[PDB]
């Protein structure tokens, strides 16, 4: 029980920001105990655990905050679609941050768990690197209204940063779509086909990850248990609409890339004709020549192979004439 | 389905109505006010001329060709009491056919 599933073993650090209307303190540490006392504090706190491959810390904080070990295993589980679970003590959501590489077109996903408990938010991540820097400066520099509100608005801000990163990823994918759409039409090779296959798989992954996100954000503003407070409904509504936008773009891109695949797949089944033509013309050309050469190659010791009128030039001339005749046999039916 | 209100789209000011098509060339308002006695055809470009026909007793047909000018659609909706979400649905083009019954 309580086993880590991902593939990250690089770094593990803990970060805490405690902000109020006037008070603010941000720090980083690597001891699980130091973040424990913040639970009973009335101030809105943000706790971040970058490395969850150390299961002991995860279990320790789970026991401290009085949460079910099943959701502990869900946090440790990494291959899972986003979901939302409303419990009386805490509300627990699962999201996925995406990263893209334009040099090598691949999509990397990281599972991130967010738990809201009264005046605290707990974030569990896979590796180091976040999309929450804008909200980090929002708390740090007091710009914006993040400090005035409670931890529900902090959950809203984290989800907003998530969907903003989704928008950036969609911009990168749109540029890739344009490049590939031009290249497939005007540069047909195998690398284009491999890139199109990779792009289709990446868009399928995006669809499978984003469609449950719509349901999560719908739940966070329709069911709205007392944890989120009635003052935060419109913001989650806005994030829900943003998720709708991201979806609709995802299906549009999927349709376009499927059309590209269909075009290339239609271009195939005519290379068979060309290659068959090449094979059959070279066979019809060169099998007769080999046939005659072998026939004159047999040593029966009684063949009229004497010089006479020079046999070798005559044989070569006749063979070349036969080859030219076989060539002329083609192109009559447009071969 | 729950309640309905204007969607919030990233990158736009709140409550902004945008035409989502590709045609931005033509605009006219053609009005046919007909009755049992005689008809009235009136093609124009000014938008204030057609607005008073909301209270006309005889049947009226107000054909606005060209919705790329969102201000005309917004003015017509504001005068006729059309809900802003209905105006957004008018302007939004990527939409399957549908019907909605209001009061």
């Amino acid at each position, epitope marked *: 029980t309580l086993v880590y599933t991902g593939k990250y073993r690089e770094d593990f650090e803990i970060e805490v920001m405690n902000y109020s209307i006037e008070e603010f303190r941000e720090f980083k540490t690597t001891d699980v105990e130091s973040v424990l006392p913040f639970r009973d504090s009335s101030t809105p706190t943000w706790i971040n655990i970058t490395g969850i491959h150390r299961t002991d810390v995860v279990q320790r904080v789970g026991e401290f905050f009085g949460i079910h070990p099943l959701v502990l295993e869900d946090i440790l589980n990494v291959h899972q679609r986003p979901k939302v679970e409303f419990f009386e003590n805490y509300v627990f959501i699962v999201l996925k941050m995406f990263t893209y590489d334009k040099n090598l077109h691949e999509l990397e996903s990281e599972q991130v768990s967010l738990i809201l408990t009264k005046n605290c938010v707990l974030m569990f991540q896979e590796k180091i690197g976040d999309v929450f820097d804008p909200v980090r400066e929002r708390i740090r520099y007091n710009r914006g209204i993040i400090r005035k509100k409670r931890a529900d608005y902090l959950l809203y801000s984290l989800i907003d940063a998530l969907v903003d990163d989704y928008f950036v990823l969609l911009e990168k994918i749109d*540029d890739e779509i344009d490049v590939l759409e031009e290249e497939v039409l005007e540069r047909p090779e195998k690398e284009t086909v491999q890139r199109t296959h990779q792009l289709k798989r990446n868009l399928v992954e995006l669809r499978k990850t984003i469609w449950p996100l719509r349901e999560v954000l719908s739940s966070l503003y329709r069911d709205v248990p007392p944890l989120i407070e009635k003052e935060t409904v419109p913001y989650f509504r806005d994030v829900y609409d943003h998720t709708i936008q991201i979806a609709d*773009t995802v299906e549009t891109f999927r349709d376009i890339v499927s059309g590209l695949l269909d075009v290339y797949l239609s271009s195939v089944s005519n290379k068979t004709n060309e290659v068959m033509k090449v094979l059959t013309i070279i066979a019809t050309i060169f099998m007769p020549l080999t046939f005659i050469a072998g026939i004159y190659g047999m040593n029966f010791e009684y063949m009229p192979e004497l010089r006479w009128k020079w046999g070798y030039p005559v044989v070569l001339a006749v063979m070349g004439v036969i080859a030219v005749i076989m060539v002329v046999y083609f192109k009559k039916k447009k071969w | 389905m729950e309640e309905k209100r204007l969607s919030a789209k990233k990158g736009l000011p709140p409550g*902004t109505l945008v035409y989502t098509g590709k045609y931005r060339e033509d605009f006219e308002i053609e009005v046919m006010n007909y009755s049992i006695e005689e008809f009235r055809e009136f093609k124009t470009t000014d938008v204030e001329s057609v607005l008073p026909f909301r209270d006309s007793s005889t049947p009226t047909w107000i054909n606005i060709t060209g919705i790329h000018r969102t201000d005309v659609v917004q003015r017509v909706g504001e005068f006729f009491g059309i809900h802003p979400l209905v105006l957004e649905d008018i302007l939004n083009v*990527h939409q399957r056919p549908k019907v909605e019954f209001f009061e």
Partner: antibody
Amino acid sequence: EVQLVESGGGLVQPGGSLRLSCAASGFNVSYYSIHWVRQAPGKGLEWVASISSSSGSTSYADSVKGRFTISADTSKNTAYLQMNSLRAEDTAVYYCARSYWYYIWSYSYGNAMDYWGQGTLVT
Amino acid sequence: DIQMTQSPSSLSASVGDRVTITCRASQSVSSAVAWYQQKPGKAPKLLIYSASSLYSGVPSRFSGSRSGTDFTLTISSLQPEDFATYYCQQSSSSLITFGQGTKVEI
């Protein structure tokens, strides 16, 4: 019919202030977005600010943030840009341009300014 | 901030020629690039929006193309009225950014 007129320009002392007024005719500033575009003498165009009067959301370039302030009055169909703490690089010709939005994909929108005024010189 | 560069900084051509001016965007702007024309001493005039669409009433000599993250404005056949400066907008973000402009002269 659609027309934009710029006024309020003129020479001013450094570190001072100057209010530029953009009067719009033939269209309602409430339904559209209004941008201020700055062109230095013998230089390329630069973006100053944008106002969406219906929503009240304003946007500023990072090079004039804070010093410049943009607002709009719907009653007079006017767009005001008041400039404080003017510096040496601000001497330029200011144009006022109305822009609409267009749809590329369900996640991305762009705007293109249709009608521009004659522009006013500020030193 | 999204920085656009544009080349060439000045292009010389005669009437009847084809002229291409290309913008490169540092970041990724989806397709919200706009091409404007400014004659000396007068306000700019919008030519192309959405990287491939023509503003109403603009002559079909101008055309636009987008390869991924760089865009091209191509004039098939010049005319004496097309000898002006050409500018380049990105509008994906709320902060519009211009190019430095290319002066097409004789």
